[PDB]
Amino acid sequence: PAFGMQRMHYRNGDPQTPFQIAEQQIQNFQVANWLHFVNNNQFRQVVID
Amino acid sequence: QFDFRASMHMLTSNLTFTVYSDLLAFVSADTVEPINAVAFDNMRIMNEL
What we know:
Chain A is mostly helical. Chain A is 37% helix and 0% strand. At the A-B interface, loops of A face loops of B. Chain B: This is Inner capsid protein VP2. Chain B: It is found in: Virion.
């Protein structure tokens, strides 16, 4: 709603999360840079001691 | 005049029938799970969250 575009129609069980769709459809830069960290936030499996 | 030798007739029929009336009392139908029910196309009805 804050960008003026039509709200997304998300069907059940799609393989993409709605943040993973809305980084392609959006066109800003400061709100598409935060939206890329949320999709690529993962634990780092390292072996210590 | 009543001629006995010219009035005999051999009536022909069957031996054994078994006549039924309600034909759909033999089938036993069942619905699929209603969250997965498809329309005239491939996709399911009421899919959008």
